[PDB]
């Protein structure tokens, strides 16, 4: 084991892409804590 490049590149690269997609899901599915922290401030302002 210690002592097919195509798959190492094809996932890694597909794996790499799943991660990049996940990075975007982190931002849109989501990073909305930025806006919802504003909800945490503002909506309680009814109180």
């Amino acid at each position: 084991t210690r002592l097919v490049k195509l798959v190492q590149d094809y996932n890694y690269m597909q794996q790499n892409d799943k991660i990049k997609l996940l990075n975007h899901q982190i931002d849109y599915l989501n990073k909305e804590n930025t806006e919802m922290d504003s909800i945490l401030r503002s909506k309680p302002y009814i109180a």
Binding site: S42, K43, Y45, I46
Partner: protein
């Protein structure tokens, strides 16, 4: 503080705006009236 504010806030900006205009006009009018 969901919709009512939104409407009141919109109105607030307007009510203000109206005042902003009258304040400007009054300033202009004192020194329009003059002598």
């Amino acid at each position: 503080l969901s919709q009512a504010n939104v409407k009141l806030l919109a109105e607030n900006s307007s009510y203000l705006e109206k005042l902003r205009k009258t304040e400007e006009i009054l300033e202009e009018y004192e020194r329009r009236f003059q002598i």
